[PDB]
Write a protein that binds this ligand. Structure first.
Ligand SMILES: Nc1ncnc2c1ncn2[C@@H]1O[C@H](COP(=O)(O)OP(=O)(O)O)[C@@H](O)[C@H]1O
Ligand SMILES: Nc1ncnc2c1ncn2[C@@H]1O[C@H](COP(=O)(O)OP(=O)(O)O)[C@@H](O)[C@H]1O
Ligand SMILES: [Mg+2]
Ligand SMILES: [Mg+2]
Lengths: 321, 327
């Protein structure tokens, strides 16, 4: 439990689902923190939080991200994952759509927005840098490198200074000079993802996208302390859930269950994704998974697998009704 | 020949586009080939190709599928034969669109599917023709190997139907057969039906994507001519909307059996297993003789769906194996 929170966000019905007379098979209870699926009876699950279909972008940021970002600012490493079937709002949650953050903008812009705000406001001295890479078929593609050819992919090495840490050789890290750059950066990176799909067949719903902001901080108070700090926040938009049956999800899972159940050897090195994230992941870092689901019976089968998966990663006991 | 296998590819849907899927399907009507790009990471040369009796691209209109697949079969039905057309494929790829369409007036609406078009043509031809005739229709769905009657006004309830063995025929006790007096009458019947189907889904959890759905139109004809060979005929046309190809081993088992039946019919090999599934037994009547049977395999253009599209083409190729040809 503790460091690791797991929450389910359910999206609204889409046009397709309506048009097909699809039935809402999912009950979301925010307050009892329970999801239920009608299979007729019902299977009920419990999570640290549950977000019904009416929840706005800000509600998510506020109850999920804020605690974590406080911790990153404190100079730690965190990860927020979005897991679930394609079309259930992973990206929507993680990025969003087009001064204050447009109500449709998701976690990544808000995160960037907030970072500047707080550090400017407390007069901390800091520099922000972001990087974006996707993992397709256990192979790393840098989405921010303006130069490289599409077939170019990055290799990682062990970090001599850090037993948990890793070195991605060649990875572009762009410097961010204000809260608005994020967008055009997210745009560079979308141009490239496209390209990799057209030319390499690495389709975005079939791969993991890892967006990583690293904050260098120096805080100073006369008669106080001089703190030197580096926080880092990896915001991970996972490959579509339906690809199980691909195996990086199973490992990601095996690693979260281990972390939560506290078993002797957490298998980080058995997948690229968890290898890379191994530096968040574990001691005293908030880690969070947002599982996305559809309400409709059209998608029932996948909705279930997602919830089995969330359930398996952090197994909470159903409280008496 | 008698068994026709055809393929219909739909346009992209909203999901696929929100998902950034790319077109992997290429349909060639003249060559009657369909080819799908199978490339994994950095593979652009890997393409799989299949030939069928006809191929429809994403832009093929309702009426054009009708003119091509149906008319020939209907002629056969109208001579007093028992015939079946199937729709097979992954959920969301247009099985129901193809069989039903989307709904008033005399010239069929452009989104009308095979069902209201078929009823159209029957009245239009028999009327014009001076045939003394009647048309009844039944609509049942088969879920979990259990029969349900979607046309019965009463029995709004679970209530399955019991199937006996008629002394290649078979009897379903209690099946509503509605008599149709006018062509335009066919729409309310498809709504009565759609309605029940949906109740069944909400109350019994039989979602239409899990069910085989069977719409049976039986025609009775007496055709007379002076110095003309007075004639009596019964036509029957089974339009079957299959469950999505993607207790589940029950759905799989039946679709597999269908395929065994379809192949047995082509190789002419004796012992086609009409009896392995409730679906094939219910239909044994119209698969039995040498009579036009035809299958429409529906598919998605999108990369997101590639595995299922392949499965579907694999299925259709197994049903009737027609070699890829040169040039
Ligand atoms: N919680 C939500 N509220 C409103 N719209 C949503 C929500 N989740 C998803 N959508 C919409 O559903 C569609 C699929 O979203 P997307 O994030 O692309 O799914 P994924 O990235 O998981 O494949 C998009 O049109 C998105 O705007
Ligand atoms: N060939 C097609 N042309 C135009 N629209 C189509 C086609 N096939 C399917 N659609 C649309 O796609 C959606 C799903 O079709 P549907 O027939 O319900 O698929 P299935 O019945 O095989 O699950 C419907 O909105 C339908 O109108
Ligand atoms: Mg997406
Ligand atoms: Mg259907």
């Amino acid at each position: 439990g503790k460091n690791i929170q797991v929450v389910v966000r359910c999206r609204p019905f889409n046009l397709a689902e309506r048009k097909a007379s699809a039935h809402s098979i999912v009950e979301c209870d925010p307050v009892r923190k329970e999801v239920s699926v009608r299979t007729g009876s019902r299977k009920t699950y419990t999570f640290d939080m549950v977000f019904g279909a009416s929840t706005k972008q800000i509600d998510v940021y506020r109850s999920v991200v804020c605690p974590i970002l406080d911790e990153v600012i404190m100079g730690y490493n965190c990860t927020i994952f979005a897991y679930g079937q394609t079309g259930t709002g992973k990206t929507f949650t993680m990025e969003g759509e087009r001064w204050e953050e447009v109500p449709l903008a998701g976690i990544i812009p808000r995160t960037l927005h907030q970072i500047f705000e707080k550090l400017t406001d407390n007069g901390t001295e800091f520099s922000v840098k972001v990087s974006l890479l996707e993992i397709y078929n256990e192979e790393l593609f840098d989405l921010l490198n303006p130069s490289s050819d599409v077939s170019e992919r990055l290799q990682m090495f062990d970090d001599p200074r850090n037993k948990r840490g890793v070195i991605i050789k060649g990875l572009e890290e762009i410097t961010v000079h204000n809260k608005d750059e994020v967008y055009q950066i997210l745009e560079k990176g979308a141009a490239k993802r496209t390209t990799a799909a057209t030319l390499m067949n690495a389709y975005s719903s079939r791969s993991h996208s890892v967006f990583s902001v690293t904050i260098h901080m120096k805080e100073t108070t006369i008669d106080g302390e001089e703190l030197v700090k580096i926080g880092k926040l990896n915001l991970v938009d996972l490959a579509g859930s339906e690809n199980i049956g691909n195996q990086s999800l199973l490992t990601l899972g095996r690693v979260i269950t281990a972390l939560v159940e506290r078993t002797p050897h957490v298998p980080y090195r058995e997948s690229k994704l968890t290898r890379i994230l191994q530096d968040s992941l574990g001691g005293r870092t908030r880690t969070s998974i947002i599982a996305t689901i559809s309400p409709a019976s059209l998608n029932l089968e996948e909705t279930l697998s997602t919830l089995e998966y969330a359930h398996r990663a952090k197994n909470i006991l159903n409280k008496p009704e």
